[PDB]
Design a binder for these strands. Structure first.
Length: 115
RNA sequence: GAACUUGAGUGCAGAAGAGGAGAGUGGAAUUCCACGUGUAGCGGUGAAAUGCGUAGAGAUGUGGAGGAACACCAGUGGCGAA
């Protein structure tokens, strides 16, 4: 039973995962578009991000959270939907923080697609 | 052969620079390894599948290993014969 937590939203182009943890990063609960039965294109859509956030939130509310800090990673379109969905579940969102990993010129990226 | 100082160079006084070689050091990120929390998918596509995952993955926290490259600055900006 913990109150304050961080909501890690990993929004990629293919899927949106939402893990909810305590302030010390111990996992309370998590949800992802795939876990909710979305497949392929559907998982990417922002609608699925909403549903993923709601499902993750309702799992956490059992443990008794009230305030969430939000961290967003990846280039997906889910972050806004997932954040608004967390607010709609009742948990107040203190601050959103983009923590997408930025290399300072490190590893060579994979070759560009010729689509 | 003898003069001259503009070319060329030297002296003296300043200026900028990713110019080069050598030796160190630093932060981000990817991967891997160990551990805590935690559960059913993760990944990928135009759509899928191969692949990875209940032998506990992906997500998340701490620490560690190693290799390569140096975000912002950064600019028809600088330096170099290329």
């Amino acid at each position: 039973n913990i109150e304050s937590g961080i909501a890690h939203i990993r929004s990629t182009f293919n899927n949106t995962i939402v893990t909810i943890t305590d302030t010390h990063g111990n996992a309370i609960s998590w949800s992802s578009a795939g876990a909710l039965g979305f497949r392929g294109s559907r998982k990417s859509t922002p609608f699925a991000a909403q549903m993923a956030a709601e499902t993750a939130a309702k799992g956490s509310i059992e443990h008794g959270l009230k305030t969430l800090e939000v961290t967003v990673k990846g280039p997906g379109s889910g972050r806004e939907a997932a954040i608004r969905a967390l607010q709609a579940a009742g948990l107040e969102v203190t601050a959103i923080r983009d923590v997408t990993p930025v290399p300072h010129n490190g590893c060579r990226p994979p070759k560009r697609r010729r689509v």
